Design a protein around this ligand. Structure first.
Ligand SMILES: CCCCCCCC/C=C\CCCCCCCC(=O)OC[C@H](O)CO
Ligand SMILES: CN(C)CC/C=C1\c2ccccc2COc2ccccc21
Length: 428
């Protein structure tokens, strides 16, 4: 009895939220992206669900029998099966794009364009609208819904379960496991200082007679190369001959990092900033210590306070005014960006793909979270003959209708251009 309007309010948001996404694409020139046409088709399939499938399913909960009749009832049987297939198809067609978009950036051959996007978003609705055929095909009554004409046929029910869900969901996952393997580093501190200082695998003697190896590991008190070789041989624990390996350079690096954190904590002006700072932001501070030293870094009084005080933009502006920034600009920018955002962005490439991959994963994570339980419930009924009530079966169909309400909410959380367009349209 209280769940009459509960499912209705859910339907009320879906009619607008999906409509908002559809308006946002046509209104903004910044949202006219080729990969956003696949987000359009998914919002179309999810709107049909809100305006047609959702209100007609509320009536069956209020009035046990259908006030619909043959024309409305056969079309509702089509629009539920066509839109849900279109949803998995929009997702599978979107993932195939991101994959080729990741693999070949230079698809200036007419592949990342309307002529190739609209050709695959029209052809996807052809494989989805094929559902209207077995809706009128009896040539080959119950209390759950309008009745699918083949509800008794358990051999066909399992074949459409795989062809329309189990088959795409496995191929979709296979392709995504490949996308996630292409943009998967996410840096660390060794990788960060490798970008900034460089990794030398052979002892280098500079202009003032200084012996460097690895990620700028100086070989202290080495008058001659043989003294530097003998100190390095003691450190590494072998007869290197001035030549070390990446893994040795990393072992040595890891020592210098502990040595830097120990020194930071032995520092009065430093210890409070470091302690307040997160994982990545500590790396940006260690990085500075590695270039200027405990003493040099601790003479960054104002900025260090802004950092401690969690004023990231204030600090990023202040640090950008420093003499350090004027002298080493590209390192200072990468370090300052890291203090500003608290991310490894400055030390990573393909950030647009990286961002878009998290969004695709979020979309796929919703569609499997919403429909799986229902499809695994179909795996149950197939041989049991009704092992459970229609009190929970009514929820697994509505949880799938929850994905239709959930997807318009996903887009701004991951996409930046959507987040601002959604905020600007709400405050008119
Ligand atoms: C004293 C022995 C001298 C060092 C013997 C090890 C030789 C070695 O491993 O050196 C490789 C070489 O430097 C690659 O150019
Ligand atoms: C009642 N309705 C919500 C279920 C129909 C939606 C399906 C489905 C279920 C069983 C057999 C075929 C199909 C059509 O394809 C789908 C694809 C993705 C998600 C749900 C369905």
């Amino acid at each position: 009895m209280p769940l009459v309007v509960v499912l209705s309010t859910i339907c009320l948001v879906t009619v607008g939220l999906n409509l908002l996404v559809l308006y946002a694409v046509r209104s903004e020139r910044k949202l006219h992206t080729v990969g956003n046409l696949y987000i359009v088709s998914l919002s179309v399939a999810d709107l049909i669900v809100g305006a047609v499938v959702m209100p007609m399913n509320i009536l069956y909960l209020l009035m046990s029998k259908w006030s619909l009749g043959r024309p409305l009832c056969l079309f509702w049987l089509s629009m539920d099966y066509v839109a849900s297939t279109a949803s998995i198809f929009s997702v599978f067609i979107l993932c195939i794009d991101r994959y080729r978009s990741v693999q070949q950036p230079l698809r200036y051959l007419k592949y990342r364009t309307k002529t190739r996007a609209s050709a695959t978003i029209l052809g996807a609705w052809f494989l989805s609208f094929l559902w209207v055929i077995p809706i009128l095909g009896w040539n080959h009554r119950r209390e759950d819904k309008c009745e699918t004409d083949f509800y008794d046929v358990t051999w066909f029910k399992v074949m459409t379960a795989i062809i329309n869900f189990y088959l795409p969901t496995l191929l979709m996952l296979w392709f995504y496991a490949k996308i996630y393997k292409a943009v998967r580093q996410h840096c660390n501190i060794f990788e960060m200082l490798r970008i900034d200082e460089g990794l030398r695998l052979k002892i280098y003697k500079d202009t003032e007679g200084y012996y460097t190896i690895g990620i700028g590991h100086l070989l202290t008190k080495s008058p001659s190369l043989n003294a530097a070789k003998s100190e390095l041989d003691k450190a590494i624990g072998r007869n290197t001959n001035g030549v070390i390996t990446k893994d040795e350079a990393e072992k040595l690096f890891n020592q210098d990092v502990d040595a830097a954190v120990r020194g930071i904590l032995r520092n009065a002006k430093l210890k409070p900033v470091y302690d307040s700072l997160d994982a990545v932001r500590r790396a940006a501070l260690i990085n500075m210590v590695f270039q200027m030293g405990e003493t040099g870094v601790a003479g960054f009084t104002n900025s260090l306070r802004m950092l401690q005080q969690k004023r990231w933009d204030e600090a990023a502006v202040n640090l950008a005014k420093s003499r350090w920034y004027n002298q080493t600009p590209n390192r200072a920018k990468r370090v300052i960006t890291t203090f500003r955002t608290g991310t490894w962005d400055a030390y990573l490439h393909m950030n647009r793909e990286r961002k878009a991959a998290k969004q695709l994963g979020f979309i796929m994570a919703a569609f499997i979270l919403c429909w799986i339980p229902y499809f695994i419930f179909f795996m149950v009924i197939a041989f049991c003959k009704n092992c459970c009530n229609e009190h929970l079966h009514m929820f697994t169909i509505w949880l799938g209708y929850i994905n239709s309400t959930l997807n318009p909410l996903i887009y701004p959380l991951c996409n930046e251009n959507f987040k601002k367009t959604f905020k600007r349209i709400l405050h008119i």
